[PDB]
Amino acid sequence: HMEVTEEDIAEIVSRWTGIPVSKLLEGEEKLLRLEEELHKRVVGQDEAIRAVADAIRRARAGLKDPNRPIGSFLFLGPTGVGKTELAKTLAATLFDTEEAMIRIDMTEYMEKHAVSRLIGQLTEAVRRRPYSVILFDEIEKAHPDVFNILLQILDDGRLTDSHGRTVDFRNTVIILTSNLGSPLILEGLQKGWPYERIRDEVFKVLQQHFRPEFLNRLDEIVVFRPLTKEQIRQIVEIQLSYLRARLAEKRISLELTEAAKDFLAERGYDPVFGARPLRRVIQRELETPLAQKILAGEVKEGDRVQVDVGPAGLVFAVP
């Protein structure tokens, strides 16, 4: 039908039921091309994306335990290389909006009485949103008791609160994240440890916090890799999207050189936080002098701006 769209109908069903549009429109095939959706935003990390996609494909084919969340993942490796981005993108694609991602920072869940806070910070959030990606950040800091409740989610896709009434988790996607090993790998490189030492050290620290009985309940254990220079160069480009869209209103083009992107990349990426400090770097190195250039009148309506590297920082040109 022409005047009435698929979206029009889907929205009605979506609003009456509470089922996301995406979920109603999953079949109209996208599951086949879900890796490319996630690639629009998550540069690199091809293994992590396939994992997540393969897990979701299995649940959608009716091949997994129905009494479980759709997917359960442990995302290991360094921070700032795509974990949160992926989690968000995952929510936006499967459940329409990033607002459909619940983030539990386990730093607040270390001192025993933290279970009650969950059961109901967690249980209430998943009560009003049955269709949600749940992001447990740095899960290794979490207290044992708080870890026990997480297993209950992994066992039957449900969880009891204070009243006794169970909250359904069978439509949720659980992503757990941790750095464990990475800071340690950084230690041994700065301390000149032999490879096998570092490798032995990481393994035992992982064994301490995550015991087989818990990992067995997970769909995939993903280890995120550090980014290559080329991957970072694409991360720079993506991060510019908003600025470039802001300038585009006044028909202003922002055209960086090869050296320019590397410059930002160098200072906006480090092995500790990955690419997380890049935003502030862009804002300081490029967005600052550009603002000055505009307000000085040296950059105008429709102007094409060429960004190059220099000795002082970034140099700007008008052709």
Summarize the structure in short.
Belongs to the ClpA/ClpB family. This protein is α/β, with parallel strands linked by helices and 319 residues long. It is 47% helix and 14% strand.
Describe the structure.
The protein is α/β, with parallel strands linked by helices and 319 residues long. The chain has two domains: 1-226, P-loop containing nucleotide triphosphate hydrolases (Rossmann fold, 3-Layer(aba) Sandwich); 227-319, Helicase, Ruva Protein, domain 3. The protein is 47% helix and 14% strand. It has 16 helices and ten strands. The strands form three sheets. A five-stranded parallel sheet has the order 2-3-6-1-7, with helices on both faces. It has a three-stranded mixed sheet with strand order 8-9-10. Helix 9 (182-190) packs antiparallel against helix 10, helix 12 (229-239) packs across helix 14 and helix 14 (258-268) crosses helix 15 (278-285). The longest helix has 15 residues, at 46-60. The protein is globular, with a radius of gyration of 23 Å. The termini are far apart. The PDB classes it as chaperone. The entry lists the keywords AAA+ protein, disaggregase. It forms a monomeric assembly. ClpB NBD2 from T. thermophilus, nucleotide-free. The protein: Chaperone protein ClpB.
